[PDB]
Amino acid sequence: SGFRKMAFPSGKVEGCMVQVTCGTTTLNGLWLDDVVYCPRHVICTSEDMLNPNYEDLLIRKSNHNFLVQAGNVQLRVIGHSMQNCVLKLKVDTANPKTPKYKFVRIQPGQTFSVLACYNGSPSGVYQCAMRPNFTIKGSFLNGSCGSVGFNIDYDCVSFCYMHHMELPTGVHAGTDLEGNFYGPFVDRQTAQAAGTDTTITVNVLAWLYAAVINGDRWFLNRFTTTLNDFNLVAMKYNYEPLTQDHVDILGPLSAQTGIAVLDMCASLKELLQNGMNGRTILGSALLEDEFTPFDVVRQCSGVTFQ
Amino acid sequence: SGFRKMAFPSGKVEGCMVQVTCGTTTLNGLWLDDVVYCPRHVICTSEDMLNPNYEDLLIRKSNHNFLVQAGNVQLRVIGHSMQNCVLKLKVDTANPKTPKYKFVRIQPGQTFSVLACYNGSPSGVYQCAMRPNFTIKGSFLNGSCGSVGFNIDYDCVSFCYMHHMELPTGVHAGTDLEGNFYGPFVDRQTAQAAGTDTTITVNVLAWLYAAVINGDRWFLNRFTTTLNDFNLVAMKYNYEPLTQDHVDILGPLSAQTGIAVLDMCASLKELLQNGMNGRTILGSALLEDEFTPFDVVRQCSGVTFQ
Ligand SMILES: [K+]
Ligand SMILES: [K+]
């Protein structure tokens, strides 16, 4: 049946993307009801970016400083405010294509779909994980800022990411839709180090379950382990600790397959210690960690969105 | 920066997906204007599937044998015809969300986005390649049939694939939207072997260029090669021949990077012979072959879709 990096359908988000311009900067905004959300660094000039006082930069701004274009339609800005690192432009028109939505702060490990946009227009869609160091390994270019990450549950878009910057290492950083950065990052052009990145253990386990559902059973072994003994081995290979909450979320998959989580953990332990011996799991020679337990179920069970 | 399996935005295709039921079988249909396209095997019972006479099975069908549901709206079937292996159901309502579209027959190695659907509702979107043996390595479950593959150019959806079946090996086969199978496959439950699958060489090269654009240069070596000497090594590793046309299509990327195609070929030759020495290219320990030269440009240049 197969297994792919599978993104949510993008239709609901496509109709919310607009172009926002201020000064010398154009980037993307999210148009929901009569508000457009975008990164507040759009108000900065190059020189402002080095040490911006945003409260003061925004006071000196007027509604007429902001050009918002939805397709070939100018939206008139009739108000502006700042929530943390997000700019909220109140416009004269509610988006008639506003979907059901919420703003959610995700945790490291968790995944989301990215609708990469330039000039308010979608370029493509791909699946991403919030890395344990609060960066994402996206595919983004100049002008991508304001592009959002999202999950869909039924008909409800949960927006969890807005793109703000690329770090020097070529990885990406941003906020929830309430404007709070994931990670120790600030929207200021000043050197800022990403933490060291670790592997998302719960996701590697989820993917091993995916492999079992798709037939691959060679890595299942006769050994077992305790959670603590597993985490001790994990730590040494730069894997995130496995928590009881992780074990619980892997429940549905353990039930579906009949293999218990601690059994799978022992299977992973061996994989970490010995390697794969030039074998592949779901076409991969590396252990893949950008699929959550929910992602595997959704794909392996055929969950749909309406 | 960054490089991902990036799918086209799915919005334009989402609004064309419907549920088609006949007998006890439910699968997906593509609703364009007042026609719904779906696999004709929807008219077969399990017993019919072993040796179907489609002309005769269809004569014995009436419009009222087909239930089409678009969301919670029943579309009334008022006509039916068969074009090769695709069923065309004429319905009472033109799709108000019909996009600009064409039907295109793609070639092996070319890529496309898949909107996996169940019960006329989208589950997810992912990027696919037409394998050299005319199969696709999709992620599809029971009820996925009628799901389509597509590219977008500007505002125009080019439909290139409709899903019909999974082979025993777990790979997938289907038709263009005129109903002609890609490959030597038939919509009959009778043993059908996929040809031996080879690696899409031009795509591996395109991806190596992507890797260079993103920094990775460790695999660039001091050697060069002729096209023929390359193809001799390629053949031995189950790689498709590299043609002059392939060399020409890689031109833009060779220009962008400054590395000539035959130089990159030599870099690949060594990778094939020695392996990767536990190193990775764009996060991968395997050579990836599901990105075309165009795909790399689009993603690395930031092409957008109206
Ligand atoms: K600016
Ligand atoms: K070389």
Author numbering:
A (entry chain B), B (entry chain A): 1 to 306
Sentences from the study reporting this entry:
SARS-CoV-2 3-chymotrypsin-like cysteine protease (3CL protease) also known as main protease (Mpro) mediates the maturation of viral proteins by cleaving the two viral polyproteins pp1a and pp1ab at 11 sites. Mpro represents an attractive target for the development of antivirals against SARS-CoV-2 as it is essential for the viral life cycle and structurally conserved among alpha and beta coronaviruses, allowing the development of potent pan-coronavirus protease inhibitors. Here, we report a new class of peptide-like inhibitors of Mpro identified using the commercially available DELopen platform (WuXi AppTec) that provides a library of 4.2 billion compounds (screened by the user) as well as the services necessary for the sequence to structure decoding of binders’ DNA tags. The identified inhibitors were peptide-like compounds containing an N-terminal electrophilic group able to form a covalent bond with the nucleophilic Cys145 of Mpro, as confirmed by x-ray crystallography.
The compounds interacted with Mpro mainly via a covalent bond formed between the electrophilic P1′ group and the catalytic Cys145 close to the S1′ subsite, and a hydrogen bond formed between the P3 group and His163 in the S1 subsite, while P2 and P3 hydrophobic residues occupied the S2 and S4 subsites. This C-terminus to N-terminus orientation is markedly different from the orientation of the natural substrate of Mpro and its substrate-derived inhibitors, which usually have the C-terminal amino acid positioned in the S1 or S1′ position while the remaining peptide chain and N-terminus extend toward the left side of the binding site. While both SLL11 and SLL12 were proven to bind to the active site of Mpro, SLL11 could also get enriched during the three rounds of the selection process when the competitive inhibitor X77 was added or the reversible covalent inhibitor GC376 (43) was preincubated (10 minutes) with Mpro. This proves that SLL11 was able to outcompete to some degree both X77 (IC50 = 2.8 µM) and GC376 (IC50 = 0.15 µM) used at final concentrations 14 times (20 µM) and 3.6 times (5 µM) higher than the concentration of the protease (~1.4 µM) respectively.
